[PDB]
Amino acid sequence: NSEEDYPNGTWLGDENNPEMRVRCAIIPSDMLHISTNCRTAEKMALTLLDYLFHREVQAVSNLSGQGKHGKKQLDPLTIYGIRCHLFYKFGITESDWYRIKQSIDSKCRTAWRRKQR
DNA sequence: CTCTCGCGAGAG
DNA sequence: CTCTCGCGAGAG
């Protein structure tokens, strides 16, 4: 939320808009790897996921924190940052963000499916 | 691996 | 009953 949280990290979203920006952990070198190879909001979303949540946090959680498996909830502020970074770099819509959330939940489901094996 | 379907439980 | 939502899983 404030840059003092992560010093060597970067900003998710628009740096010059204090209301639509989140400070996160990934280093400026990884943040250029993402904005270079991820040329669609769908690929950027799931690359940001791998780089913002340790995979065994992915294998134990989902977005809302509900469900029959009783998974934990992924950080609502981190998920907000992904929402700003996709809006800022791609100008996604409310329906576009809904599809993205479905992809994120499906990615975390496969991480859960793996963990059992 | 991602994408996306459809099932079935619970909220409304 | 309709809708929302988590889910397993197959296909690409």
Residue numbers in the entry: 208 to 324
Show sentences the authors wrote.
pmcThe BEN (BANP, E5R, and NAC1) domain is a ∼100-residue protein domain found in metazoans and viruses, but missing in nematodes and urochordates. There are nine BEN domain–containing transcription factors in the human genome, i.e., BANP, BEND2-7, and NAC1/2. The BEN domain-containing transcription factors regulate transcription by recruiting chromatin-modifying factors to specific chromatin regions via their DNA-binding BEN domains. Further structural analysis revealed that although all these BEN domains bind their target DNAs mainly through the insertion of the C-terminal α5 helix into the major groove of DNA, the residues of the α5 helices involved in the base interactions vary from one to another, explaining why they exhibit distinct DNA sequence preference.
BANP has been reported to prefer unmethylated DNA, and methylation in the CGCG motif significantly reduces its binding affinity to BANP. Our ITC results showed that the mCGCG DNA displayed only a 2-fold weaker binding affinity to the BANP BEN domain than the unmethylated CGCG DNA, and the CGmCG DNA exhibited a similar binding affinity to the unmethylated CGCG DNA. Hence, our binding assay results indicated that the BANP BEN domain was likely a methylation-insensitive DNA binder. To illustrate the molecular mechanism of the BANP BEN domain in recognizing the methylated DNA, we obtained the crystal structure of the BANP BEN domain bound to an mCGCG DNA. Similarly, the C-terminal region after the helix α5 is disordered in the BANP-mCGCG structure. Superposition of the structures of the BANP-CGCG and BANP-mCGCG complexes revealed that these two structures superimposed well with an RMSD of 0.34 Å over their 104 Cα atoms, suggesting that the methylation of the cytosine within the DNA did not cause significant conformational changes. Like the BANP-CGCG structure, the BANP BEN domain interacted with the methylated DNA mainly through its α5 helix. Similarly, in the BANP-mCGCG complex, the side chain of S313 formed a hydrogen bond with the base of T4, and the side chain of R316 formed two hydrogen bonds with the base of G5′ that is complementary with the methylcytosine, while the methyl group of mC was not involved in the BANP binding. In addition to the base interactions, Loop 1 also was involved in the interactions with the backbone of DNA via the residues N269, S271, H276, and K278.
